[PDB]
Amino acid sequence: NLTDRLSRTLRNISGRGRLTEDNVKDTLREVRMALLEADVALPVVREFINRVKEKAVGHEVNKSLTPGQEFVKIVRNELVAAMGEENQTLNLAAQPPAVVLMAGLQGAGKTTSVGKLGKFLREKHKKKVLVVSADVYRPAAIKQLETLAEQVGVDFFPSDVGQKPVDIVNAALKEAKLKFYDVLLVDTAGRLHVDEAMMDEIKQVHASINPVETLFVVDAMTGQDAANTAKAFNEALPLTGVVLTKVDGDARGGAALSIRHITGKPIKFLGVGEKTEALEPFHPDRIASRILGMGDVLSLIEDIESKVDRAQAEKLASKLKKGDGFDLNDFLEQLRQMKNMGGXXXXXXXXXXXXXXXXXXXXXXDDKVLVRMEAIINSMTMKERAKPEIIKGSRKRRIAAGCGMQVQDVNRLLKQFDDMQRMMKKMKKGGXXXXXXXXXXXXXXXXXXX
Amino acid sequence: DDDLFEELEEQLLIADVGVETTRKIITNLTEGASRKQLRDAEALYGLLKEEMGEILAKVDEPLNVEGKAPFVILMVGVNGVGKTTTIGKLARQFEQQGKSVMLAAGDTFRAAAVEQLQVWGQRNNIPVIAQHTGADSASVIFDAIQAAKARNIDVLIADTAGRLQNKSHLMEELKKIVRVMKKLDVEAPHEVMLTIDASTGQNAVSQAKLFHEAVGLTGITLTKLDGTAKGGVIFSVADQFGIPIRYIGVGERIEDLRPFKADDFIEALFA
Ligand SMILES: Nc1nc2c(ncn2[C@@H]2O[C@H](COP(=O)(O)OP(=O)(O)O)[C@@H](O)[C@H]2O)c(=O)[nH]1
Ligand SMILES: Nc1nc2c(ncn2[C@@H]2O[C@H](COP(=O)(O)OP(=O)(O)O)[C@@H](O)[C@H]2O)c(=O)[nH]1
Ligand code: ALF
Numbered sequence: 157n158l159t160d161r162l163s164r165t166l167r168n169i170s171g172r173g174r175l176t177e178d179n180v181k182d183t184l185r186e187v188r189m190a191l192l193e194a195d196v197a198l199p200v201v202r203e204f205i206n207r208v209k210e211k212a213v214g215h216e217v218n219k220s221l222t223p224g225q226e227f228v229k230i231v232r233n234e235l236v237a238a239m240g241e242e243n244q245t246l247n248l249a250a251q252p253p254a255v256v257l258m259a260g261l262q263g264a265g266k267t268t269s270v271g272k273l274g275k276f277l278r279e280k281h282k283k284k285v286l287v288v289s290a291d292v293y294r295p296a297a298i299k300q301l302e303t304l305a306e307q308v309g310v311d312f313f314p315s316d317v318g319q320k321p322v323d324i325v326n327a328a329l330k331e332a333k334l335k336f337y338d339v340l341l342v343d344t345a346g347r348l349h350v351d352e353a354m355m356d357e358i359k360q361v362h363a364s365i366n367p368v369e370t371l372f373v374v375d376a377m378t379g380q381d382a383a384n385t386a387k388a389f390n391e392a393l394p395l396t397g398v399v400l401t402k403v404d405g406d407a408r409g410g411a412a413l414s415i416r417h418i419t420g421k422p423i424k425f426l427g428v429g430e431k432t433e434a435l436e437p438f439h440p441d442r443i444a445s446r447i448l449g450m451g452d453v454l455s456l457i458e459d460i461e462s463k464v465d466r467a468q469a470e471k472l473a474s475k476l477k478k479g480d481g482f483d484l485n486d487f488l489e490q491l492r493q494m495k496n497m498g499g500x501x502x503x504x505x506x507x508x509x510x511x512x513x514x515x516x517x518x519x520x521x522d523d524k525v526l527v528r529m530e531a532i533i534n535s536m537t538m539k540e541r542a543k544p545e546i547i548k549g550s551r552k553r554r555i556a557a558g559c560g561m562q563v564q565d566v567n568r569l570l571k572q573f574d575d576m577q578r579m580m581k582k583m584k585k586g587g588x589x590x591x592x593x594x595x596x597x598x599x600x601x602x603x604x605x606x
Numbered sequence: 607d608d609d610l611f612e613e614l615e616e617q618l619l620i621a622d623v624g625v626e627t628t629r630k631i632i633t634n635l636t637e638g639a640s641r642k643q644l645r646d647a648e649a650l651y652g653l654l655k656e657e658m659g660e661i662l663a664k665v666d667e668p669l670n671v672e673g674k675a676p677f678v679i680l681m682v683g684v685n686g687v688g689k690t691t692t693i694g695k696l697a698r699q700f701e702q703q704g705k706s707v708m709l710a711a712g713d714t715f716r717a718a719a720v721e722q723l724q725v726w727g728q729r730n731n732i733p734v735i736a737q738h739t740g741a742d743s744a745s746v747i748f749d750a751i752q753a754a755k756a757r758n759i760d761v762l763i764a765d766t767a768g769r770l771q772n773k774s775h776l777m778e779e780l781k782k783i784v785r786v787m788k789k790l791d792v793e794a795p796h797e798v799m800l801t802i803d804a805s806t807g808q809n810a811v812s813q814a815k816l817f818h819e820a821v822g823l824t825g826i827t828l829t830k831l832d833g834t835a836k837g838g839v840i841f842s843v844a845d846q847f848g849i850p851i852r853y854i855g856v857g858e859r860i861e862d863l864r865p866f867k868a869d870d871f872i873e874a875l876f877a
């Protein structure tokens with residue numbers, strides 16, 4: 157729907173100009189409504205729209221085929237850039253034990269996240285993990301975390317509803333430091349931003365254990381309240397990251413964009429399922445790619461774009477390799493054009509001042525020499541041509557054995573090619589008239605031939 | 607006057623009502639205001655409450671558990687909407703006027719769900735039928751209904767496992783549960799409850815859609831309204847699917863369950 161709406165909008169409003177702010181109105185409105193149906197926070201929607209405007213002012217769109225497609229490309233790039241980077245991971249470098257604190261609303265899946273991160277850090281990172289339940293409120297929450305910990309093979313710290321979260325996490329931290337645990341996972345009760353006592357509680361806990369990692373667990377189906385929750389939780393605690401859960405649903409998941417924008421904290425994890433063994437890393441491009449459904453439209457476009465890309469790549473590379481300078485390719489061309497057009501008898505006539513000093517019969521026969529040169533060049537691979545400085549003795553052996561001649565002749569032609577390269581380089585650096593007039597006839601004295 | 611349009615639009619958008627329902631409501635409010643020529647804001651608020659009141663007029667039907675032995679209420683919905691807590695509240699709520707209540711644990715998947723519903727059952731001092739984690743849910747619920755018929759239990763609440771609507775196999779499992787429940791009583795379940803979180807966005811439309819296309823939901827419970835989430839999507843699902851709203855949880859405590867009232871919902875909405 158996005159591509160269709162944008163293409164339709166850019167087509168119906170303006171013809172082919174260079175896109176201007178006046179043409180992006182209905183575009184921005186349709187994108188706005190698209191994000192509103194995506195359950196994205198309205199202020200985030202507006203602040204994104206502003207960036208879309210800033211990118212719309214300078215559009216290079218006119219030179220392409222489909223304006224809506226490249227506009228979609230720009231929006232996707234900006235959105236991915238807004239989602240942050242990849243390979244985001246908790247800091248297990250930390251001085252052990254590493255303390256990870258959980259925060260979020262009720263039924264956010266914080267406990268299941270503790271189980272997932274438990275199995276993940278235990279198996280993959282080879283870490284010794286201790287888990288503890290700070291929840292004295294929710295019935296059988298401690299038993300749940302204990303069960304999950306028993307399933308993932310992670311040691312569990314005993315706790316009950318008769319205790320207090322502070323003493324619980326303090327005893328857990330003490331036990332973690334005493335038994336030399338690598339990672340301390342702290343699960344806490346789901347709480348509302350409108351609750352003062354619970355916020356003071358999680359603040360006292362965060363102050364008590366001083367966690368190196370504070371994770372914010374929010375549902376993917378969360379609505380406009382995600383703004384309030386993200387803001388309040390961000391102002392209450394110095395979040396080190398955000399953990400999104402229930403991404404496997406059909407939900408739009410604009411709440412991720414909301415929290416990411418408002419808090420400014422990166423998303424390090426995406427729950428892909430209910431089970432403990434199911435966890436996925438956060439990929440900005442994957443999340444920013446899909447809120448939609450469609451078919452058969454994007455395939456042809458992606459194909460054509462690929463064709464244009466590979467064509468422009470090959471055509472630019474072909475000019476780039478030939479634009480490096482003078483090589484054995486151009487030398488080969490000049491040599492075949494030589495042997496075809498060879499003017500030795502005529503060039504002896506064309507030259508006047510050089511014939512008065514040098515011998516008249518000193519001119520070598522073009523046919524034999526240039527056939528030898530052509531054939532010897534034909535014994536060379538394309539790499540030794542474009543890059544002549546990689547030629548060594550063994551390659552000279554291959555060449556000489558291939559053409560059925562002596563290596564000294566190969567060295568001779570490499571010398572002549574060196575001379576030609578130097579000369580043509582001097583022609584490229586200076587003027588052809590300054591360089592043609594700079595040509596000098598060397599005489600070692602005023603005596604002829606001495 | 608455009609500032610009023612923008613303001614009202616933003617107010618309706620931050621309530622998670624949806625753009626379609628917003629378009630409809632704004633349109634009808636525009637026609638109504640143009641017709642009645644209201645020059646004051648209070649009359650605009652009143653007319654708005656009248657329109658949305660007409661939207662909630664169909665869904666105001668209360669739940670009646672009387673007349674059936676037992677009266678089976680199937681609690682369904684997505685993950686973490688607090689179905690179990692709602693059951694824990696409904697236990698005492700149904701215990702108050704003298705109706706005997708028994709609880710059934712239908713979630714054998716999630717950890718310590720059985721133990722949780724056993725805690726909620728202990729708080730209400732009522733028998734709870736469950737077996738073990740990993741057991742067949744339909745069998746447990748079936749045995750619960752049979753026992754309820756033998757024990758002459760007035761009201762039986764049957765829990766279910768948290769399931770996403772996009773998963774078809776779980777839907778087929780729930781359909782199996784219902785089909786099994788059709789054996790003892792043809793009209794069972796008498797009440798199908800969809801528990802929706804207030805923080806839920808437009809996804810609730812799809813949730814209610816598939817759950818209605820599957821289980822044939824006879825009711826909807828909106829919990830977690832003690833936060834800043836007003837759950838305005840309920841207007842959309844009530845518009846499309848016309849499903850009644852039984853109650854609203856105002857908190858985690860057992861006394862936090864209240865009968866759904868349109869006027870109170872309106873009062874809490876704009877505030
Ligand atoms: N599909 C899916 N379900 C999840 C995920 N995380 C949690 N859940 C569900 O959430 C339910 C319990 O949530 P819970 O962890 O007890 O809430 P919390 O302890 O307050 O964070 C479980 O039944 C899970 O099915 C997830 O990443 N994906
Ligand atoms: N504040 C508040 N919390 C709720 C409400 N309903 C449920 N909860 C919380 O949600 C938590 C877990 O929900 P749960 O019953 O396990 O989800 P479910 O069993 O999958 O439906 C419980 O600890 C409750 O405290 C509500 O209406 N208000
Ligand atoms: F349901 Al919780 F912390 F486990 F709110």
Ligand code: ALF
Pocket residue numbers: 684685686689690713716719766767768769
């Ligand atoms: F946490 Al549940 F069904 F009890 F998803």
Ligand SMILES: [Mg+2]
Pocket residue numbers: 266267291294297343344345346
């Ligand atoms: Mg928990």
Ligand SMILES: [Mg+2]
Pocket residue numbers: 689690713719765766767768
């Ligand atoms: Mg449950």
